[PDB]
């Protein structure tokens, strides 16, 4: 998830700075993965700590 | 941290908003369809603010929305459109008689008298009872206009048509003829008619004869635009050789209104609008005069005090461009444009002095013309 | 002058309305019995608070 | 090897059009914040209303330089038409009841998106 | 410290807000939707007395 994507992220010819790492869907989607109600609540609990990011990229998991 | 919205609020939408542009009068759209949540026989007239606030009427009904969309589409926008409820009965129990329609109209003024223009659409088109409205809008300080969708106007010989049976006899209505599916009265009336301010200098739109609508297309024909609009090519406008109406023709790629919204042979719409503005201004100023001063005595002293209102409204109107410029057209010699005559109360007996109703003040005008046609000769000598 | 009192304009209409008025009772009628206390009647003053701004709204309609 | 289709989101909504508008919004918010903190107070009149309007009237000017706003020409005709207009409500009429909330009315701004090019056509008619 | 050091006899010296002011030396608190229970402030419409307690917290939005 992190390194195999952050390596590409920090690889542009001009480089960005201060990449942000998340913790949102630490629960495996939910107790019942068929319902997304746990995922929305997981997202709702990550803004309150910090609202500085602008782009959301999920990778190596949560695919489709 | 915390979002920036705690101190501000910035949106980003995709719509079309137009300037406020206050005006003179507001129009009324009366039909049979009712929403029963706001208009059910308790509020026969309802106000609005913009197309967004239009929720009660269906966003695809033919009468209200398909005309209000055109009405709110002028490059400067009018405000506070009024929606009616008048002919909620389907004309009448016996549609052959208009007696129910006149009574329906008589029951909508009492709720509210604020509108100035009457536009009926998507229904009541060329219906026989509709003639009652023509009878009712006279002896009344309003303007009502009917946009027929199709008729035998193209033949200048028939008489069964609206503008044919009534032709030069009515002075307060006009027919915005077009083809079907075009709501046209709303496009110009109360969209361009309303958004004019007469108190400013040179703001007299005497023509209304060369004006573009919001969004609408042209009709077709070259010698058939003489049967309609009853306009002679060069000499003038003949009432016998056509029906006086409007069609929004185009000459270049430029599509514009034509014939200047006449009502009779040579009675143009702006001449009615300006006089109605003068009347409705003098009434308001007279009202604002009994309420400020305590009392107006019943003598010449108080008589000139009442005369002071027209003597200022005429002065404020000649600046706009409605009154002629103190020159007799016959000779170009001197002649006053407007004169105000005040009766002398010195002789009026006590018997009629106890009514507390003043005698009548008289005012004289001189209409200021316009131009609708030009002639050039171009004589070449070589 | 400081900016505590409103600027002589009625917010309802923007028409004229005095910002502050001072009313003084007339001593011409006060009897001798209450004139011997050496305590003056009451003067009344009218304000008009001058507002401020804590929040802003912008719309930003884009036509393309 | 290069990216293709320009990162669309719907039929013809490209990513940069979203990014630029988000930048404009996040810039106006910061500038508005930096305005209550410098001056002590912003009065509730037209005088203070134009003072708040001063921020978008500068951000739009700074953005048209970048190349996000169209260049004051109506594409339909090539005639004159303003690229951006800022409308400010008049506080002169707002009653005291809603004047006590200390929340200003809304300012409106009009854009004109500046296009780009993704495709080209040439004809090459040869006469010999 | 800021309330005292204001002179009202001068022109335009009316600090009606007291709503955007920095302290001498102190740090911020934390929370995004919890600064509504405290300070009882509605996000957009206004300030509701029922939906919070009216107080002050010295929040930060930028680094400010």
């Amino acid at each position: 998830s992190v390194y195999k994507a952050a390596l590409s992220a920090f690889s542009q010819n001009p480089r960005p700075i201060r990449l942000k790492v998340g913790y949102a869907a630490t629960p495996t989607g939910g107790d019942d993965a068929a319902k997304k109600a746990d995922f929305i609540t997981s997202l709702g609990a990550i803004l309150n700590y910090d609202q500085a990011f602008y782009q959301i990229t999920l990778d190596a998991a949560l695919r489709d | 941290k915390l979002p920036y919205s705690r101190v501000t609020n910035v949106t980003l939408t995709r719509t079309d908003n137009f300037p406020t542009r206050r005006g003179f009068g507001t129009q009324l759209i009366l039909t049979h369809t009712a929403v029963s949540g706001q208009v059910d026989a308790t509020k026969r007239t309802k106000l609005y603010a913009s197309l967004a606030e239009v929720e009660a009427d269906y966003p695809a009904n033919t009468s209200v929305y398909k005309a209000a969309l055109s009405a709110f589409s002028q490059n400067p926008r009018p405000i506070r459109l009024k929606v009616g409820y008048a002919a909620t009965p389907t004309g009448g129990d016996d549609a052959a008689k208009k007696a129910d329609f006149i009574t329906s109209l008589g029951a909508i003024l009492n709720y509210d008298q604020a509108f100035y223009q009457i536009t009926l659409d998507a229904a009541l088109r060329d219906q026989p009872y509709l003639d009652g409205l023509v009878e009712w809008v006279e002896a009344q300080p309003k303007i009502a206009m009917i946009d027929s969708n199709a008729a035998g106007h193209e033949d200048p010989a028939n008489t069964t048509v609206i503008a044919a049976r009534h032709k030069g006899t009515v002075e307060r209505t006009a027919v915005f003829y077009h083809t079907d599916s075009t709501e046209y009265l709303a496009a110009s009336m109360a969209a361009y008619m309303s958004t004019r301010v007469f108190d400013d200098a040179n703001s007299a739109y005497t023509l209304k004869f060369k004006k573009a609508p919001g969004v609408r297309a042209i009709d077709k024909g070259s010698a058939v635009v003489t049967a309609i609009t009853g306009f002679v090519e060069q000499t003038g406008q003949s009432e016998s050789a056509g029906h006086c109406a409007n069609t929004l023709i185009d000459i270049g790629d430029q599509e514009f209104l034509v014939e200047g919204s006449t009502l009779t042979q040579n009675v143009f719409l702006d001449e009615i609008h300006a006089t109605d503005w003068i009347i409705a201004r003098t009434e308001e100023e007279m009202l604002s005069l009994f309420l400020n001063n305590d009392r107006v005595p019943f003598t010449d002293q108080g008589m000139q005090q009442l005369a002071s209102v027209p003597r200022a409204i005429m002065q404020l109107a000649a600046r706009a461009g409605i009154v002629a410029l103190d020159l007799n057209p016959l000779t170009g010699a001197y002649e006053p444009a407007y004169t105000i005559t005040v009766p002398s109360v010195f002789d009026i007996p006590e018997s009629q002095r106890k009514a507390r109703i003043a005698p009548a003040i008289q005012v004289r005008f001189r209409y200021a013309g316009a131009v609708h046609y030009s002639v050039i000769n171009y004589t070449m000598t070589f | 002058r400081a900016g505590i009192v409103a600027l002589d304009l009625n917010p309802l209409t923007g028409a004229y309305e005095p910002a502050y008025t001072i009313t003084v009772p007339s001593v011409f009628d006060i009897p001798e019995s209450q004139r011997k206390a050496r305590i003056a009647p009451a003067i009344q003053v009218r304000f008009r608070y001058a507002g401020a701004v804590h929040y802003s709204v912008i719309n930003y309609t884009m036509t393309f | 090897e290069f990216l293709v289709e320009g990162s669309t989101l719907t039929q013809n909504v490209f990513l940069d059009e979203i990014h630029a508008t988000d930048w404009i919004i996040a810039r106006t918010e910061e500038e508005m914040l930096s305005l209550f903190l410098n001056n002590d107070r912003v009065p509730f009149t037209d005088q203070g209303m134009q003072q708040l309007a001063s921020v978008p009237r500068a951000i739009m000017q700074l953005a048209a330089r970048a190349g996000i706003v169209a260049l004051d020409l109506n594409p339909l005709t090539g005639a004159y038409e303003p690229a951006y207009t800022i409308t400010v409500p008049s506080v002169f009429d707002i009653p005291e009841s809603q004047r006590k909330a200390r929340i200003a009315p809304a300012i409106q701004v009009r854009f004109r998106y500046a296009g780009a090019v993704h495709y080209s056509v040439i004809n090459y008619t040869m006469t010999f | 410290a800021y309330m005292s050091t204001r002179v009202f006899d001068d022109a335009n010296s009316a600090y009606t807000l007291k709503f955007k002011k920095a302290p001498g030396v102190r740090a911020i608190d934390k929370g995004s939707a919890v600064v509504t229970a405290i300070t009882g402030f509605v996000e957009q419409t206004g300030q509701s007395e029922s939906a919070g307690h009216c107080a002050n917290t010295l929040i930060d939005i930028g680094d400010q």
Partner: protein
């Protein structure tokens, strides 16, 4: 919305956020002049003509202030900031509420400085600022 009488009580000017208050007496207290002429007509020896249009959209503004005005303090701080080495824009914009006539700029710079005259009475302090772009606003209410 009648075109009311002109008055200095409806003209608003903003210089880097804060307002401008202390202005000297006179019919000209804030004057903006364009950089160069809009164009130039060239007529040849035969009678033909050709007009040339410039790309210089720049302007200068002159502000006259009393010796005791908070704007004077702000400007004399900005001047010292520039002298130290810092260089920034400080946008300035002014407008008339009666006819929406005026203009705005995004990045200005102090170009001139006043002369400190003491004498027996108060004297003007004139500041001259220069922009690289200047956008006037079209007077929509005539």
């Amino acid at each position: 919305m009648a075109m009311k009488a002109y008055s200095m009580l409806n003209v608003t000017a903003t210089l880097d956020g804060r307002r401008v208050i202390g202005l000297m007496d006179g019919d000209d207290a804030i004057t903006t002049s364009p950089g160069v002429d809009v164009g130039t007509m060239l007529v040849g020896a035969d009678g033909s003509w050709l007009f040339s249009q410039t790309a210089d959209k720049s302007a200068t503004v002159v502000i006259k202030l009393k010796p005791n005005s908070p704007t004077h303090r702000q400007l004399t701080e900005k001047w010292m900031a520039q002298r130290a080495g810092r260089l920034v824009g400080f946008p300035f914009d002014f407008i008339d509420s009666a006819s929406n006539e005026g203009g705005t700029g995004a990045e200005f710079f102090i170009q001139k400085a006043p002369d400190d005259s003491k004498g027996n009475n108060a004297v003007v302090r004139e500041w001259t600022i220069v922009t690289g772009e200047w956008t006037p606003t079209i007077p929509t209410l005539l």
